[PDB]
Amino acid sequence: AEPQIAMFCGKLNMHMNVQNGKWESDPSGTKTCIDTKEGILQYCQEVYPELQITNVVEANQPVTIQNWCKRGWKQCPHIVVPYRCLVGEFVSDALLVPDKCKLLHQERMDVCETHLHWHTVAKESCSEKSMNLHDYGMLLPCGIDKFRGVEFVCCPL
Amino acid sequence: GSPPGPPEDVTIDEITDTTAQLSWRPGADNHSPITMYVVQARTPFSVGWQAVSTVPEVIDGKTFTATVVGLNPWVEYEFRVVAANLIGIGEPSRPSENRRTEEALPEVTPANVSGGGGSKSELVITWETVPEELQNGGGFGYVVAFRPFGTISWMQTVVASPDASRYVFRNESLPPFSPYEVKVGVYNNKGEGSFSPVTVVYSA
């Protein structure tokens, strides 16, 4: 469905086949987990050669992937947080706002922060309102997997 | 006798989001008593100089300060003062210093919210950008909301650029040429504005 890569150190990297919706192993059969966000961007671009990959961001929920392989597609379950391979000009995510829930957002031109930082901001913001955080997404990229803001949905308990 | 000379030393004493306190001093009346002062304003968006409303509504020739009202928030203003006597309206003063009104909540929602077309399984939403003089503050942006026609929950996204006029929702499971309720709202650094009226837009 959506372009994304998933890693578990010791195994070959996985990526989402957008045509059939299945997770597939590294095409070269050699690439394992990557240490920098810049390297993840390069791997996204390698495994999606037809797509204009411009950034990466952690997915918001983990996925259970079976059939992880070792080097050479040998010895082919792990619950991992994948990285979304973002395409072209940055497009903010559309968030579900159910009845009685509220869309909140925060943009700070002097702050360049991580996905984890903005998740914490959104979670604490909903909690301080006696509400629960549901969907959230990043705003305003300032680097590779770095952002200046967050959009998020708070819902009643 | 002749119309009055230019008033002098026009100053913006204080400025808010919609008002400004102005002060000035009299120029020559040219042998006919000054009976009225009028205030004009100029912005980057006006067609030259334009009259503005004041408190008091009519400034007599014995008054040298007044409050200008009905100003546009977050807009660069200059003001000038013109005297009049029985012979006629006089020459305008030199303009005041340039000062921007304070920020305020945005009040205008985007015009001509619409959409349609696009590539396979795309929902295209468009609107007319809100011009700078109606954004009412820095940090202006849009909130785009859409839902399948007849449902309750809204899909919403923050479009943080004030120059944006278009949002495309790409999803492979989105059905073809299906009706969506769509509305577009506004916000700025002072806080949230309102949503436009709802309109119906079809996917590709």
Residue numbers in the entry:
A (entry chain A): 30 to 105, 109 to 189
B (entry chain B): 595 to 798
Quoted from the paper:
We first sought to gain structural insights into CNTN–amyloid interactions by focusing on the CNTN4–APP complex. Because human APP(E1) seemed prone to aggregation, we attempted crystallization of the chicken and mouse complexes. Although both the chicken and mouse complexes crystallized, only the former yielded crystals that diffracted well enough to allow structure determination. Overall, there is little change in the E1 domain of chicken APP compared with the published E1 domain of mouse APP ((36), RMSD of 0.475 Å over 155 Cα residues), which is not surprising given the 94% amino acid identity between the two proteins. The FN1–FN3 region of chicken CNTN4 is characterized by a sharp bend between the FN2 and FN3 domains that appears to be a hallmark of vertebrate CNTNs. The binding site involves the second FN repeat of CNTN4 and the copper-binding domain of APP, though it does not overlap with residues involved in copper binding. The complex interface occludes only ∼600 Å2 of surface area, but with a high shape complementarity coefficient of 0.78, which is consistent with values calculated for trypsin–trypsin-inhibitor structures. The interface is stabilized by a network of main chain–main chain hydrogen bonds between two antiparallel β-strands found in APP (L127–P130) and in CNTN4 (W748–Q750), respectively. In addition, the side-chain oxygen atom of S124 in APP forms a hydrogen bond with T751 in CNTN4, whereas its main chain oxygen atom forms a hydrogen bond with the side chain of Y761. In the chicken CNTN4–APP complex, A126 forms van der Waals interactions with the side-chain atoms of M749, Y761, and F763.
Contactins (CNTNs) are neural cell adhesion molecules that encode axon-target specificity during the patterning of the vertebrate visual and olfactory systems. Because CNTNs are tethered to the plasma membrane by a glycosylphosphatidylinositol anchor, they lack an intracellular region to communicate across the membrane. Instead, they form coreceptor complexes with distinct transmembrane proteins to transmit signals inside the cell. Finally, structural analyses of five CNTN–amyloid pairs indicate that these proteins interact through a conserved interface involving the second fibronectin type III repeat of CNTNs and the copper-binding domain of amyloid proteins.
